[PDB]
Swiss-Prot record, chain A:
Catalytic function, reaction form: TSAVLQ-|-SGFRK-NH2 and SGVTFQ-|-GKFKK the two peptides corresponding to the two self-cleavage sites of the SARS 3C-like proteinase are the two most reactive peptide substrates. The enzyme exhibits a strong preference for substrates containing Gln at P1 position and Leu at P2 position
Portion held of the full protein: 3241 to 3542 of 7073
Gene name per UniProt: rep
Residue ranges constituting the Peptidase C30 domain according to the UniProt record: 1-302
Source superkingdom: Viruses
Species classification: Viruses, Riboviria, Orthornavirae, Pisuviricota, Pisoniviricetes
Compartments, as annotated in UniProt: Host cytoplasm; Host Golgi apparatus
Protein name: 3C-like proteinase nsp5
Segments on the Cytoplasmic side according to the record's topology features: 1-302
Role noted for this protein: Cleaves the C-terminus of replicase polyprotein at 11 sites. Recognizes substrates containing the core sequence [ILMVF]-Q-|-[SGACN]. May cleave human NLRP1 in lung epithelial cells, thereby activating the NLRP1 inflammasome pathway. Also able to bind an ADP-ribose-1''-phosphate (ADRP). May cleave host ATP6V1G1 thereby modifying host vacuoles intracellular pH.
Description of how the protein assembles with itself and partners: Monomer. Homodimer. Only the homodimer shows catalytic activity.
Active site: 41 (for 3cl-pro activity), 145 (for 3cl-pro activity)
Length: 302, 301
């Protein structure tokens, strides 16, 4: 009894952070085995950001151009290459602290923990969700470029995200561990806007279900609605429209609680048009949209 | 602005599984001692107002199964300190960090490493509520999960979880075994004072909003403490004491906004709502961010 957004223990990830400097620029690197991962824009010097040719800047540099520091001890860089927007430095020492890990690409709506790092040193950890416009909120303001996002499964650590830039709207944009961006974002300092900031409807429903499992129930109603009508309404309030696959994903949660998806939808529709009016659901005065149908199980369903 | 918890590595390396009889809960391993809730010695036949004293005597070091990973630690001594059990094990935790035991106060924040069976499962940032409780999300057997802060390289342990009150909120003790609030470790009626908003923290959050360029809500008029306090009580906000005004000084100093000015801004916001506008993104005010949190975080160095 008591729900709360939680991040994964950062322990195993903190032992993988390092510091990478090139010229006058310093940011976070990810040390796994004999490799350190970090944004390629580290080889860009402040003014070259307007429109860089990473291919050209990179060739004009040697292993000796890079300074990595495992905390205070320095690692020798004996190789460098570029995989998309990521820089891959081959080091002489294989990180003794390397955990079991995988590289995966997540989708908007999915959640993961972020270990906000400051110049190579761990500063804070938070749980967030990839927004529908492919960005990540959590205005973790600082020199955190290179901070990694991740999920911890059993013993395995799955890295899903790496931080690259702050968009001209706040919110952040990053890449997966293969160097491919999330969203229609480029590694430059050109004008760029992210899509519309919308609520993750799938997650909000997940949350209402969890609340139901948690004895909370005041918002429920005997009405049922169609997917279209519910979608027509949701959009007026800035909630993402619910696609068919989304309703499938709400399957299990719908098994327990014995509440049909379209039932819960009618409940949310009512909440949208009327409001909570001071009352709270599961503790907040606002709806939580960063909890996934899965999280709901990983913590409840059982 | 997103509230972060402290990285949990240093505390993870201090978590062990403690099992007595049929119960299994978490424990804190510092040097050669394991700290955990005394109610692990309870027996199913005695957890409805247990006689811990008796239950303690009827126990030897062998009743305890202390686990750290795949390795077992033989307990070689056991004593009680208030609501806590202190077990001396044969191994001195090689990972012990520099630490301190501190008694925190309502309104102050900390990170909680939610554990299950001696296993780090989740980590979060919360504030000790004004009625001496915390709104933790708790899974099965997370008792023993601790609260802490990280100041420099020193870990400040300030809380250990014991109970889940009838209200659903949580109650624990400091690392000396003494509860926070008028609660005891046993299934009893006991209720907590209603939950009120931490005014000091909201004011702290508005200062931080101002530091980050968000200031549309800054009114022009002023108010007294009495007047501000009356409006606050109206909206279920804890009253503001001189004590709290002094704590805001550093923030008042960096921004140039006198405390009574910010109380004037909050006062208007409460009496009028945010009109859909946002502050640091949220459409609602945050109260689990303290004055010191704003100094530490809003100062990268």
């Amino acid at each position: 009894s008591g729900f709360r957004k939680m991040a994964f223990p950062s322990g195993k990830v903190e032992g993988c952070m390092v510091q990478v400097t090139c010229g006058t620029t310093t940011l976070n690197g990810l040390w796994l085995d004999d490799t350190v991962y970090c944004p390629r824009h580290v080889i860009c010097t402040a003014e070259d950001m307007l429109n860089p040719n990473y291919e050209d800047l990179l060739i004009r540099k040697s292993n000796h151009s890079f300074l990595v520091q495992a905390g205070n001890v320095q690692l020798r860089v004996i190789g460098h290459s570029m995989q998309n927007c990521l820089l891959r430095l081959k080091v002489d020492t294989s990180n003794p602290k390397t955990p079991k890990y995988k590289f995966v690409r997540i989708q908007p709506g999915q959640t993961f923990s972020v270990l906000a790092c400051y110049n190579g040193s761990p500063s804070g950890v938070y749980q967030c969700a990839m927004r529908p416009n492919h960005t990540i909120k959590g205005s973790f303001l600082n020199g955190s470029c290179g901070s990694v996002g991740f999920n911890i499964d059993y013993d395995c650590v799955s890295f899903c995200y790496m931080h690259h830039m702050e968009l001209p709207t706040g919110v952040h944009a990053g890449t997966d561990l293969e160097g491919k961006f999330y969203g229609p974002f480029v590694d430059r300092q050109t004008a760029q806007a992210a899509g519309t900031d919308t609520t993750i409807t799938l997650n909000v429903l997940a949350w209402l279900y969890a609340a139901v499992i948690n004895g909370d129930r005041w918002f429920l109603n005997r009405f049922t609605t169609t997917l279209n009508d519910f979608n027509l309404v949701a959009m007026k309030y800035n909630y993402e429209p619910l696609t068919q696959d989304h309703v499938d994903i709400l399957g299990p949660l719908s098994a327990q609680t014995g509440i049909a998806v379209l039932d819960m939808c009618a409940a949310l529709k009512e909440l949208l048009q009327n409001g909570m009016n001071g009352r709270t659901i599961l503790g907040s005065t606002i709806l939580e949209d960063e909890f996934t149908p899965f999280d709901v199980v990983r913590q409840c369903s059982g």
